[PDB]
Amino acid sequence: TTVFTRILDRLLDGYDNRLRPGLGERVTEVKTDIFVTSFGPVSDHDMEYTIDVFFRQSWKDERLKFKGPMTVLRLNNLMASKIWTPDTFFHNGKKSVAHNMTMPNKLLRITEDGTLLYTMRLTVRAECPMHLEDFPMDAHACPLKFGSYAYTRAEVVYEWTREPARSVVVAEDGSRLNQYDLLGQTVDSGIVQSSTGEYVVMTTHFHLKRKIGYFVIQTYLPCIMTVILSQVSFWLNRESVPARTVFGVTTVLTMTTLSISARNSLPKVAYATAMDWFIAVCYAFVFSALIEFATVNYFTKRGYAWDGKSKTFNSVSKIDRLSRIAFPLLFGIFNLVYWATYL
Amino acid sequence: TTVFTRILDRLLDGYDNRLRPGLGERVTEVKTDIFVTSFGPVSDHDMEYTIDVFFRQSWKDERLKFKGPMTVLRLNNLMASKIWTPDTFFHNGKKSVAHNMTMPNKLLRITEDGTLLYTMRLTVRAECPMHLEDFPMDAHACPLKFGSYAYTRAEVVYEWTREPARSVVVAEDGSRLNQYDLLGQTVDSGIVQSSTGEYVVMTTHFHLKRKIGYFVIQTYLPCIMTVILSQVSFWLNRESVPARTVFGVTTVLTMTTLSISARNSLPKVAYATAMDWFIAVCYAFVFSALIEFATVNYFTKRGYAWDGKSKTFNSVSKIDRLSRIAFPLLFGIFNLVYWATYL
Amino acid sequence: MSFVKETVDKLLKGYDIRLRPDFGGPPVCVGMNIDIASIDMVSEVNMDYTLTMYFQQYWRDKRLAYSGIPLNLTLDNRVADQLWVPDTYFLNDKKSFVHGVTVKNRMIRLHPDGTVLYGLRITTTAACMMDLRRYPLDEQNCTLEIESYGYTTDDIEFYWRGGDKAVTGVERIELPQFSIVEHRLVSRNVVFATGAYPRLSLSFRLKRNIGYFILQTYMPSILITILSWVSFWINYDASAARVALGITTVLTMTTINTHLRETLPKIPYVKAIDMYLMGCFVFVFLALLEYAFVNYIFFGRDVNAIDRWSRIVFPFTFSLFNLVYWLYYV
Amino acid sequence: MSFVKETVDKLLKGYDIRLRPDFGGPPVCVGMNIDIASIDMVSEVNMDYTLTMYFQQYWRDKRLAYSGIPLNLTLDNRVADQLWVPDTYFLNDKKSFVHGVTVKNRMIRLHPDGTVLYGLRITTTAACMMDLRRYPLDEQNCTLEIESYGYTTDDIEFYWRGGDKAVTGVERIELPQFSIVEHRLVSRNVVFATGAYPRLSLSFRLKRNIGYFILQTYMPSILITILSWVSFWINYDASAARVALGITTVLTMTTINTHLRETLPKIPYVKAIDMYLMGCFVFVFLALLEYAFVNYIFFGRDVNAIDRWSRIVFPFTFSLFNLVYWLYYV
Amino acid sequence: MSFVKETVDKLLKGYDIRLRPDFGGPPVCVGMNIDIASIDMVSEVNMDYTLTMYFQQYWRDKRLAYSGIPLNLTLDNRVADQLWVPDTYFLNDKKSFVHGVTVKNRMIRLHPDGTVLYGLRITTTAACMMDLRRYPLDEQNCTLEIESYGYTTDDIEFYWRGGDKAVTGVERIELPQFSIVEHRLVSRNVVFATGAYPRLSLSFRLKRNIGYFILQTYMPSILITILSWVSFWINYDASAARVALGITTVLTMTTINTHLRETLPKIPYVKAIDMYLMGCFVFVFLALLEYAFVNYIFFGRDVNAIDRWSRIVFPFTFSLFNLVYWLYYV
């Protein structure tokens, strides 16, 4: 075991971890790949998502060549902090955790050629700005960008280990999403310019699509059936003023209860989304149905309804006959225009 | 620069930071003052308040006398931790924060005489036990007590740098309170005995008074108007049974909606506050208004109302006529008793 | 790298972090610029906002001048602990941290002339006092105060590097609840009894978006109030219809206010939204109380006059209330 | 002053902190007393409670005996890292910390004979498995288990210092929802697979304040239940009035029932509040269901008899239900 | 104490934490056993559970063999940072920590033959992907995955020390919402392109308690749905009574449905409870529509037949819906 011990001590003799490999001589080329163990929950309220990854970085440091019986060396967590590693960070990260239980979840392997494979298990919260105008029928490409914080592209350049599509791998059971479907991913790279210089950025976009079955059964169907119910009032006789006033007013209250709860699920955004417009139209349809009856009652003459046997009786309102067709049709048209637009 | 550098290296020569100044010789006197930059939010649910302060401590250490061109030295953050400082803590603190951005928010100065001025910027969560019997018409004195955790009064005594009224200073734009007015403060000091001995305690009480205007428009006015609205049933004709039953029962449901919402704003206490009694009495009034109609309807003989051109008709109930006076008067009296008691 | 290694070690040999540049000389001028990454949250309850940014500081340190290398030396971020940096802090920050994955999000970059670039990625929750009386039609002015904890203007001076171009990324900021209308940079020397202290202030003017409140608060309240007026068009003898309409609208209005009391934040004082909701509640309260006057005069003790007048005064007075409300708050 | 400095240096020279006093000899006896500063939170959602206490430990360490200094040496808390301290922990705590502003709230006081006083200020969230069958008429018993983590009873022994007076400050505690009826100190041994361990238990008995729930929860339910009986005193032919009263009280009961439960976590087993609320829900459900038979048995086919008996059976059965309920839970 | 002090210093002198026991020889076998303290939380929103346990690792290291002391050395927890320990981690662990009050909750125990016992008190939040389609009648399988980070089976092997008895304390688990039905221990090798890695799995099966949802969710929904059938027994001409009943049950059902959405967690997809609430909403929706058809076919144009048939079909179809529902989920 002496031979293994000696090599470790000799490696860091004069090694300066403040200087990148090839400083002032060439450009350090870091090869990266990611294995997504679990694509964590997405928070619409905070407009962020969690992702658990094995972040692998590979680069060459000629200062760490060695010769010995073995061809691969495993470095202790203390040894890894003693050498130079890329100062990679996530541009859109909000608060990230490098797990340290029970030991540091890192691993630094050195090959005799001088190539270093450096893996760490991370939990990352990342910013995913969302345009929620199509909510709940919206799709997003949540990004995950990383690069060197301090080194410009003249000093450190990042590349994917293999074909960009195959460099990011998502575990088969790794989808931990409730309201989204991970359709796929596109992996790209480019240059981003800031006030300090030009930096290389590696980008991965996860394309998410919101599942709508929840909002169909929680919001859309109750709203549609209450609007239909508010229109069912049109088929009652015009002489039942208390019944049609109770009918119309309580459907307004039902819309208020549905509208209030429907917006609790929505993130607290101050602009209008596709569900707000649908509820606003349903609110206007329910409001108009009670205004429709108010006009019918103004032209009602006799306070008694048809007795069922035969003295004169009120005639079926012409407002009602038209409203039994116009109101369902206008709502029907609105639904086709609404759904064809967003679907 | 050399003169400044030499003094620092010389200061800690033979210095033992584990021993307080004048150990076994006299009592170390600490003069303290506070500058409240912002009296942060107060939480009724957690019975705690936040406060951002510059906590300034002053004392004398003969071991740190120096002679040189400058009369004041600004110690580094590393240097400040190498010397003895008072072990001041907050008796009612819950979870305090010492700000470390971008550097440690601390400053330690030394005068030639050996007087140390030591300041830090803190966000303190502190315990403020609240007796909420008179809520929302309650006032509180939230304390802020501190002293030496380990050193008894025979070793370390604290005092205010100047007159106690002028030792706690609040910034003019410091009040960050939404539900309270900072009337003022009183500054005192005393002695507390515990299992480990007697200790000097420096105390500050912030006198707070709750703003009532929010609760008048949110709770008191709707509840008063709902009670008034329940009495409005007394002015309807006795023959309109469905209208006065709907009137009374839905006012009960309105009070239930208001009463439940009012509690959700209240902190989760398990005793009756002032607002609890007002809502309970309003509930009793609204309850008694529907019971009153149950009695009126029990003595109605004819199901038809007066025809407008007079066959006999029911007279206006004497229960209703007396209720038109008794109910407004009893509620008016209850309001004088309630509002005089707490205001 | 042999020559560079000697040069870097040479600079830090004998370096005294405790002493500022030009110690005992002219005040060191520290230029600052900020590149805002995002404003994550703005909470009325806590009276603060969250800001993520790239915070750069520029100053000249002749102890760090180097020659012979036509390169700007970016050094491992841990060297910052070995250098002198300004004792800069944010005066109104409540909770803040430097990001630390994978390594500390910190940067030191030396330049041949001695210029030092010191950059941090900071997420800071900063205190912002808000005047929410005109909520949700309010405009807020949140700031970030940058000050030296220990030094005075005799020792250290702040300035915005690049003038009004010092702060960038504002135009790309998207907030779900606000919109950035303007931002200003202010340089000033606060004065106390002790003396003058350097100060830099970055302030944004936020104008709240109204679309959500129009559809969720104002429109339902208007429609319920208009719905309460339907009673004025119903026969006086329809007591069951007019009372059920009147009291359910009162119930609906309290349902809106109590259920939107919990969605809206806990800001416990009278705001513009409260007045409008309170005003609408009074109008529906008066509409129901109007029929009580109608019922009593007919059955107890003309009849059409009270209703005919109410069909005009209530729509008219609500318009007058709206005119006063919107003119006062807009 | 140097004499004291020299004395302390001698004690820590060669001191082994990994070995307990009298290693291999008789077990070290550790005495504990607690001063409770406050109990802050007692949460049913997390099924825990928060406790701020002064935690003192006494033991004799011959290696720390000193002579010539007629004083008890209170030392800077940073010396605790250079001494052996018991590996004491709270067996049922969920998350805890020692306060650290302005410094770590830690105390080390030595005595001439070698006695060590080790005091800490600790806020600890401790697990208290609560029995909520009788809630809100429930009485809880929350404990704090103090055990050695690594050392068995062959190495370390615990005892309460001062008997039943070892815990002070309990009388001063104020809880918004409980009253401290009693507290007890127990001492025992617990046997595991790895050997026996010393145990000290501190337990409190908590009685919940019932007055608030009477006004908030029970009284409205009682009144609505009495309201549902107003239907029995209304004419059988007032179908509109009696259905509106019947269904709105059912709605009112649901309103009470729907968002009362957010005062407690989703804890699935039957509790006393659940039985009463569901008892009242069944009664209002039956009061409206009773009219279905009343209306049908007249128009569809003893109308007064059915109404007459309900005027007695419903008040009587509800009082019988209340009698059985309150006796069972009180 | 000096003899043991020199014995320990002998062990560490020359120790190399960077080399595994039997380096270059056969793989070091590490036995593991867990004593479960509690499962504090199980959250569907985050899809994880919080676990407190005593995690023990047991292996043999010849370099730590000591002779002359007929005792098992229980040492201070700080000695663990100077020995070799396995690089064990939890694969599905979102956040975890070792308790640190009063000292770090860590244990090291040596034995004469070089056997090391290493215990840690860990609270961990472990990811558990849950299939909540059958919620609240769901059965969950939450696991803890134990793996080596940077060693293959050529260097380290894992096994459950004690067979199926390697995990104890499961009967101590008291989850208010679940009951532990079973637990298993699995030992396996995970083969990747880089080699084979040891794997240990501890898994629990959880059965959710349904009683709360019977009283809180299912019974109110059943009673409201039954209440909506009271309309079928009222006169066809009681329009005010039957519409008020029908429309208020719809409002009551929405109140139950919308407010249940708040007490229950934010799981955004269709579950078993959603299908039942949606089923009952459709039934009450149809009951209100049933009277409209009766009301229209009378005044707009048999009548007794529709009510008679609705008195049977509605209760019968709801019973059939329940039969299909409970068989498909129980």
Ligand SMILES: *[C@@H]1O[C@H](CO)[C@@H](O[C@@H]2O[C@H](CO)[C@@H](O[C@@H]3O[C@H](CO[C@H]4O[C@H](CO)[C@@H](O)[C@H](O)[C@@H]4O)[C@@H](O)[C@H](O[C@H]4O[C@H](CO)[C@@H](O)[C@H](O)[C@@H]4O)[C@@H]3O)[C@H](O)[C@H]2NC(C)=O)[C@H](O)[C@H]1NC(C)=O
């Ligand atoms: C895995 O990762 C976790 C964190 O995720 C580590 O836990 C932290 O470990 C560090 C390093 O040991 C600890 O830092 C220590 O802080 C002590 C002071 O802490 C006080 O003040 C802080 C606030 O400033 C409070 O939060 C805290 O409660 C205390 O009041 C120092 O005294 C320590 O220094 C000592 O040890 C070092 C060792 O090199 C010596 O050089 C020093 O001279 C001195 O003796 C140290 O800096 C930190 O407190 C830990 N956090 C927690 C929550 O426990 C694990 O250690 C890590 N595991 C491994 C194997 O690396």
Ligand SMILES: *[C@@H]1O[C@H](CO)[C@@H](O[C@@H]2O[C@H](CO)[C@@H](O[C@@H]3O[C@H](CO[C@H]4O[C@H](CO)[C@@H](O)[C@H](O)[C@@H]4O)[C@@H](O)[C@H](O[C@H]4O[C@H](CO)[C@@H](O)[C@H](O)[C@@H]4O)[C@@H]3O)[C@H](O)[C@H]2NC(C)=O)[C@H](O)[C@H]1NC(C)=O
């Ligand atoms: C949010 O609210 C804050 C205040 O709480 C606003 O901050 C103020 O912004 C205005 C500009 O909009 C500032 O006014 C300008 O201040 C400059 C700096 O003053 C300092 O330095 C001068 C010397 O150079 C000292 O005399 C002075 O005491 C300060 O120390 C001035 O140079 C400007 O002068 C301009 O106007 C004057 C006339 O008023 C002319 O004579 C000049 O030639 C010149 O044109 C000007 O006075 C003000 O100082 C800021 N106050 C604070 C406390 O910072 C934010 O603007 C607001 N946010 C938004 C988005 O509006």
Ligand SMILES: *[C@@H]1O[C@H](CO)[C@@H](O[C@@H]2O[C@H](CO)[C@@H](O[C@@H]3O[C@H](CO[C@H]4O[C@H](CO)[C@@H](O)[C@H](O)[C@@H]4O)[C@@H](O)[C@H](O[C@H]4O[C@H](CO)[C@@H](O)[C@H](O)[C@@H]4O)[C@@H]3O)[C@H](O)[C@H]2NC(C)=O)[C@H](O)[C@H]1NC(C)=O
């Ligand atoms: C909350 O709930 C906890 C339980 O979880 C209660 O704690 C129990 O409290 C009772 C007392 O009320 C304890 O009973 C007493 O235990 C003592 C210690 O027993 C240990 O040590 C003895 C040797 O000293 C061993 O023999 C024994 O096996 C244990 O290891 C006993 O000394 C007491 O004995 C009493 O009666 C005998 C006669 O039978 C006399 O000879 C004694 O002198 C003495 O009078 C007694 O048995 C019980 O152990 C506690 N349980 C636990 C788990 O700690 C709390 O009381 C409760 N809180 C409240 C407020 O009610």
Ligand SMILES: *[C@@H]1O[C@H](CO)[C@@H](O[C@@H]2O[C@H](CO)[C@@H](O[C@@H]3O[C@H](CO[C@H]4O[C@H](CO)[C@@H](O)[C@H](O)[C@@H]4O)[C@@H](O)[C@H](O[C@H]4O[C@H](CO)[C@@H](O)[C@H](O)[C@@H]4O)[C@@H]3O)[C@H](O)[C@H]2NC(C)=O)[C@H](O)[C@H]1NC(C)=O
């Ligand atoms: C929650 O869900 C997880 C899955 O997601 C379940 O975990 C599975 O548990 C079963 C046991 O119930 C496991 O099946 C067993 O795996 C053992 C290990 O397999 C490795 O080693 C064998 C050789 O020994 C290799 O052939 C294999 O490829 C692996 O490398 C096997 O040893 C077991 O075989 C035993 O039974 C068979 C008969 O069935 C005999 O022929 C064998 O001789 C032997 O006695 C068995 O196959 C399964 O692997 C686990 N899956 C995972 C992914 O871990 C949890 O059980 C579940 N939770 C609950 C509470 O049920």
Ligand SMILES: CCCCCCCC(=O)OC[C@H](COP(=O)(O)O[C@@H]1[C@H](O)[C@H](O)[C@@H](OP(=O)(O)O)[C@H](OP(=O)(O)O)[C@H]1O)OC(=O)CCCCCCC
């Ligand atoms: C938002 C709704 C706005 C509604 C605006 C409504 C604007 C408006 O003026 O409506 C009234 C009128 C219908 O009147 P309606 O039929 O209800 O009233 C009849 C009318 O008054 C006859 O003149 C009466 O007969 P007569 O005098 O004794 O000979 C008859 O008495 P009886 O037979 O009962 O005994 C009354 O019932 O409407 C339309 O014709 C088109 C409505 C299009 C509505 C389009 C809606 C999309």
Ligand SMILES: CCCCCCCC(=O)OC[C@H](COP(=O)(O)O[C@@H]1[C@H](O)[C@H](O)[C@@H](OP(=O)(O)O)[C@H](OP(=O)(O)O)[C@H]1O)OC(=O)CCCCCCC
């Ligand atoms: C919550 C209050 C409960 C009070 C319960 C009170 C219970 C109680 O004692 O009621 C009896 C009586 C009912 O009075 P009320 O006027 O309602 O009853 C009239 C009475 O029965 C006459 O005898 C009837 O005329 P007659 O027979 O044809 O000649 C008359 O019918 P009509 O001529 O109109 O057709 C009835 O209306 O009330 C009081 O005297 C007021 C008591 C104090 C009330 C104090 C109220 C604060």
Ligand SMILES: *[C@@H]1O[C@H](CO)[C@@H](O[C@@H]2O[C@H](CO)[C@@H](O)[C@H](O)[C@H]2NC(C)=O)[C@H](O)[C@H]1NC(C)=O
């Ligand atoms: C050091 O602490 C001891 C206690 O551990 C003190 O002894 C107490 O002294 C007071 C003096 O009035 C007596 O009333 C107590 O009975 C003593 N207690 C014990 C246990 O002996 C001692 O006084 C302290 N040192 C000094 C200098 O006071």
